[PDB]
Amino acid sequence: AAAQVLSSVESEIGRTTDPVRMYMREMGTVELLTREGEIDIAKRIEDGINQVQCSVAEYPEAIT
């Protein structure tokens, strides 16, 4: 529920031209996910990669 902070704030942002406030306020939305979300991001990544390795394994001339 951080996009709705951006919502009303931008509704009431005092004509703030500086992109620093913009970007820094935008990263405030996403939080710090840790300790296995790291490991789970890794798991999903290596899974999809090993399945593009299925995708090479399925192609015959890959060995050629």
Add this chain to the structure above:
DNA sequence: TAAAATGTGATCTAGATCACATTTTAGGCAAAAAAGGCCTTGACATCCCACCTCACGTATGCTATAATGTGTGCAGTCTGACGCGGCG
């Protein structure tokens, strides 16, 4: 009338005469040969060119304890008029 000009005439004195042989020497006409003008040759000297050429310099890659929302040193507020967007 002072002072310069004018006759004595015999005894001389440096150059001209005068026909012909021999030099010379032009001057100017033909030219031999030498020294520029033309080219060549050998020998040198210095390269331009470029063709390479290794050392030093340079473009790029990872480093696994862990660490996770700026600010930050400034401005000193000039001011009167005119547009324009809210602001009722």
